């Protein structure tokens, strides 16, 4: 008899270019007339849901509620009221959702580590690992592009941000891309794209290939 609400994540803001607000119904009976009201904190109702979902087999009845505003309107710290009233949940619903001001703001450092030589010696799939250090807002969107076009999200597996031990406020996250060994040995792009608020252009890139790790093996001098 409780309906959760989710504030949008910066990943979704970058992905869809537009801020979206959602309430998900949970633990209700199966019904059809469930309706949801999305309003701003000032009281003016924003555009409400469209094409609400159907019931849930696991008795956790779920419905779709959508509120669409730009990135700036959500950036304005606009609290929204989420109201649900129907027979299944007779009590009126009210929700308070915000974005935690007072946070720190550091630029993430993105280091792109090539696979270990042991991985290549297996001649099996090798893991490249964008390691994204010290970013305080703890909301980052790591992505991978090969040949200029992003790869499928199934191929790589970025982790959830965790605090960095040396500095409390800062965090870190790692993204692993498992790609074929033959693909790695043939000079590839393999770029890692990190999207974060503290970044100047809000998006940064790094590139690694077989050539980056190759050191200068010959120092020819030509004394004369």
């Amino acid at each position: 008899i409780r309906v959760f609400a989710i504030p949008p994540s910066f990943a979704s803001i970058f992905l869809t270019k537009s801020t979206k607000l959602t309430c998900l119904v949970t633990d209700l009976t199966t019904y059809d007339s469930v309706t949801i009201s999305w309003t701003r904190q000032n009281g003016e109702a924003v555009k409400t849901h469209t094409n609400i979902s159907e019931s849930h087999p696991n008795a956790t009845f779920s419905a779709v509620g959508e509120a669409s505003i730009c990135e700036d309107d959500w950036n304005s710290g606009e609290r929204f009221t989420c109201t649900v009233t129907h027979t299944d949940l007779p009590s009126p619903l009210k929700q308070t959702i915000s974005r935690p001001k007072g946070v720190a703001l550091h630029r993430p450092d993105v280091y792109l580590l090539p696979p270990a030589r042991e991985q290549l010696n297996l001649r099996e799939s090798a893991t490249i690992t964008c390691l994204v250090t010290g970013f305080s807002p703890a909301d980052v969107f790591v992505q991978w592009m090969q040949r200029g076009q992003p790869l499928s999200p199934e191929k790589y597996v970025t982790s959830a941000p965790m605090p960095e031990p040396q500095a409390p406020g800062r965090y870190f996250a790692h993204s692993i891309l498992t790609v074929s060994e033959e693909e790695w040995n043939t000079g590839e792009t393999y770029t890692c794209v990190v999207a974060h608020e503290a970044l100047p252009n809000r998006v940064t890139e790094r590139t690694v290939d077989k050539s980056t790790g190759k050191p200068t093996l010959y120092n020819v001098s030509l004394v004369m």
């Binding site: 090969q146 040949r147 200029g148 076009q149 790869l151 043939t186 000079g187």
Partner: protein, 101 residues
Amino acid sequence: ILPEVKVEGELGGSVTIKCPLPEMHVRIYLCREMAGSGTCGTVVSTTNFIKAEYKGRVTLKQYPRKNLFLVEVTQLTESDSGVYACGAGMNTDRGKTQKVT
């Protein structure tokens, strides 16, 4: 893989070659190897480049459902059947996927 599919031959004939289209929206091209340089040279690409010798006589076509990039040489002025190369990516030389003499 060297499935040179067409050594077809006519002064005014048209040869159509099917080409592997990976679909990750990458630049896909028809390339031609030159003996003197030793490096393959682009003749057709998703980027609208048409080689000097083949101005207007070659066309490209896309089928995502069939995953085919067809290259059509409509007038073969019987110039040297080259060892042509399908490839993808922004590196023409090392990005080749298949050969098509």
